[PDB]
Structure 1
Amino acid sequence: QNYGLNIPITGSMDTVYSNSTREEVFLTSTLCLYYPTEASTQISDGEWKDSLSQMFLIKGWPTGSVYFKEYSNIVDFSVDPQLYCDYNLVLMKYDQSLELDMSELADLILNEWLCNPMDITLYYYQQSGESNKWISMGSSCTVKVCPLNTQTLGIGCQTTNVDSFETVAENEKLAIVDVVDGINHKINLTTTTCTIRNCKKLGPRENVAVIQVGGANILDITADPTTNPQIERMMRVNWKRWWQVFYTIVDYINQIVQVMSKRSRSLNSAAFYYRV
């Protein structure tokens, strides 16, 4: 049996609101932070995890519910970001020249992706439509594509001479690459380090929220240029002191989780649905 997917739910416009649920969502869910190593370095502590946990307890979350996680930086977190955890808040420090990789990480974790494998050395690969991308993750993802015409001969590049291949993203830990949809391609991607998946983009992973810490709003989650929507799960707070940032988070946690949702969680901590 389905859960009732194709059955309508007749409601009403006079039923009275059921009462609050903040208490129950606190007592069930688990809040969870992803912060850079710079945060701990500037805090210069090591009971700060305990202090923040007790602050969250006073705010109304039971003890074993707030889990802190540490990543070296944005680009290195981008390599297979496994959100091992229920309500995800990714604190993310802005610095120049990280605009694109920061945006790519935000896209990857905010949206749900259905990823299939790709065998680069053997087959050519297209992109079906607007919602499909190629996501390449690893230690050194240099991607060089050669598009083929109707005659299986490359255009602007010969399939034999890899130098003529058009490089589309060099030396990123994560690269979400789009190419014109409907052309076969030959990819030269460094198979020892980097792995590349053909990923469709389903709806939004409406569980993880991204808190930018530095500059102006720049996260273009939608790769299409005509639209730059602003999701309520993309927050932006100025800063000088990481302690002030964490106190702001702890003080306003209720609003943040009210913005986020719990139902959109997956059994796997992976940030995509691998469908072989």
Structure 2
Amino acid sequence: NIPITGSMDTVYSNSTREEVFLTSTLCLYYPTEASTQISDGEWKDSLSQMFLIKGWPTGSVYFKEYSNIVDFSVDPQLYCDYNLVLMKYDQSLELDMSELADLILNEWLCNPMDITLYYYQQSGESNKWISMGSSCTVKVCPLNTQTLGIGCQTTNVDSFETVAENEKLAIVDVVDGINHKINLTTTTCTIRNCKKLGPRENVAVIQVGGANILDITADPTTNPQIERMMRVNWKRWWQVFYTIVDYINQIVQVMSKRSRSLNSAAFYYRV
């Protein structure tokens, strides 16, 4: 990063809202029960026409339905330029909802893990292991300096310490600085060693249900309410979508253009 000098007297520039609405795309990820309750199917076209009033051209809005939160957690591709994630809260899904929110909101640099050969440590605070799949049950057996289990026997998977069971997505943090042996169902689930970089400006999460419960920061001490974790009450999905459409300017104002020299190619819905 080179320095960029700037005066403190230059006049504020005009509003760039129209430029960004003409140049960018918005995409909404909502659960299937939304469409089920709406009981329609001209509704995507109607909402596109409705967005056109707020100033998003006809092709700018992309509605990507997903089955439900736990099933969408498994490797979410956010094919867009401004991402909204409607997220219906149900009791006992708190941790999984938080996991998904952390995953998409935060920028991660992930490396493959070969569970069958190497025992993996965690470098520090920012490192986690993310396991995604149809059913991930990661079991961890910590190891000594001589590679012998403590609280576990390295060859008896039954004595291992389970930290996730049958979960589509698990973000495990273990004690940093200790080698571990992992048992995860290699045919089903894929585990990656990831480091949390800064935040992802592209995505916003609209919790639809209950109290302020999302905790992106795995640290117990800090529980910061980030601006992109919006929340709203609901009884009717039509009311939720009308709320979003009416207040779309505020939402995209909260979000901001993504900035990262990525290396993994993937499909994007850009103009």
Q: Give the TM-score range, shorter chain.
A: over 0.9
Question: What is the TM-score with the length of structure 2 in the denominator?
Answer: 0.96
1:266 deviates by 7.2
Q: Deviations over 1:82-101 (max 9, x none)?
A: 00111000000000010000
1:64 deviates by 0.5
Contact 2:107–2:200, Cα closer than 8 Å, also in 1: yes
Map of 1:84 onto structure 2: 79
> For the structure 1 residues 164 and 263, does the alpha-carbon distance in structure 2 shift closer, same or farther, using more than 3 Å as the test?
closer
1:21 deviates by 0.5
> For the structure 1 residues 259 and 274, does the alpha-carbon distance in structure 2 shift closer, same or farther, using more than 3 Å as the test?
closer
> For 1:195-210, what aligned pairs fall within 5 Å after superposition?
195-210=190-205
Instruction: Name the CA distance, whole Å, in 2 between partners of 1:25 and 1:96.
Output: 38
The secondary structure found in structure 2 opposite 1:51 is helix
> For the structure 1 residues 274 and 181, does the alpha-carbon distance in structure 2 shift closer, same or farther, using more than 3 Å as the test?
farther
In terms of mean alpha carbon deviation, does 132-141 or 149-158 score higher? 149-158
Output the aligned Cα RMSD.
3.2
1:269 deviates by 8.5
> For the structure 1 residues 167 and 200, does the alpha-carbon distance in structure 2 shift closer, same or farther, using more than 3 Å as the test?
same
Contact 1:83–1:271, Cα closer than 8 Å, also in 2: no
The secondary structure found in structure 2 opposite 1:169 is coil
Instruction: Name the CA distance, whole Å, in 1 between partners of 2:268 and 2:242.
Output: 34
Instruction: Name the CA distance, whole Å, in 2 between partners of 1:160 and 1:8.
Output: 55
Which of 159, 162, 167 is the equivalent residue of 1:167?
Answer: 162
The secondary structure found in structure 2 opposite 1:109 is helix
> For the structure 1 residues 126 and 273, does the alpha-carbon distance in structure 2 shift closer, same or farther, using more than 3 Å as the test?
farther
> For the structure 1 residues 264 and 223, does the alpha-carbon distance in structure 2 shift closer, same or farther, using more than 3 Å as the test?
same
Q: Deviations over 1:168-190 (max 9, x none)?
A: 10100000000000000000110
Map of 2:39 onto structure 1: 44
Contact 2:79–2:267, Cα closer than 8 Å, also in 1: no
> For the structure 1 residues 214 and 29, does the alpha-carbon distance in structure 2 shift closer, same or farther, using more than 3 Å as the test?
same
Contact 1:148–1:184, Cα closer than 8 Å, also in 2: yes
Contact 1:112–1:271, Cα closer than 8 Å, also in 2: no
Contact 1:213–1:236, Cα closer than 8 Å, also in 2: yes
Contact 1:27–1:61, Cα closer than 8 Å, also in 2: yes
Map of 1:61 onto structure 2: 56
> For the structure 1 residues 177 and 207, does the alpha-carbon distance in structure 2 shift closer, same or farther, using more than 3 Å as the test?
same
Contact 1:135–1:175, Cα closer than 8 Å, also in 2: yes
1:264 deviates by 3.3
Contact 2:98–2:216, Cα closer than 8 Å, also in 1: yes
The secondary structure found in structure 2 opposite 1:140 is strand
In terms of mean alpha carbon deviation, does 49-58 or 265-274 score higher? 265-274
1:128 deviates by 0.2
Contact 1:81–1:271, Cα closer than 8 Å, also in 2: no
The secondary structure found in structure 2 opposite 1:41 is helix
Instruction: Name the CA distance, whole Å, in 2 between partners of 1:66 and 1:90.
Output: 13
Map of 1:158 onto structure 2: 153
Q: Deviations over 1:29-88 (max 9, x none)?
A: 101100000000000000000000000001111110000011110000001100011100
The secondary structure found in structure 1 opposite 2:212 is coil
> For the structure 1 residues 131 and 212, does the alpha-carbon distance in structure 2 shift closer, same or farther, using more than 3 Å as the test?
same
1:9 deviates by 1.3
1:7 deviates by 2.6
Question: What is the TM-score with the length of structure 1 in the denominator?
Answer: 0.94
Contact 1:138–1:193, Cα closer than 8 Å, also in 2: yes
Contact 1:138–1:195, Cα closer than 8 Å, also in 2: yes
> For the structure 1 residues 267 and 45, does the alpha-carbon distance in structure 2 shift closer, same or farther, using more than 3 Å as the test?
farther
Instruction: Name the CA distance, whole Å, in 2 between partners of 1:166 and 1:100.
Output: 19
Identity level (%): 100
In terms of mean alpha carbon deviation, does 10-19 or 221-230 score higher? 10-19
Are residues 1:271 and 2:266 paired? yes
Q: Deviations over 1:196-219 (max 9, x none)?
A: 000000000011000000000100
Instruction: Name the CA distance, whole Å, in 2 between partners of 1:253 and 1:149.
Output: 54
Contact 1:114–1:272, Cα closer than 8 Å, also in 2: no
Contact 2:80–2:270, Cα closer than 8 Å, also in 1: no
Unpaired segments ≥5 residues, structure 2: none
1:274 deviates by 20
The secondary structure found in structure 1 opposite 2:110 is strand
Unpaired segments ≥5 residues, structure 1: 1-5
Moved over 6 A (4+): 265-276
Instruction: Name the CA distance, whole Å, in 2 between partners of 1:226 and 1:136.
Output: 24
Are residues 1:122 and 2:117 paired? yes
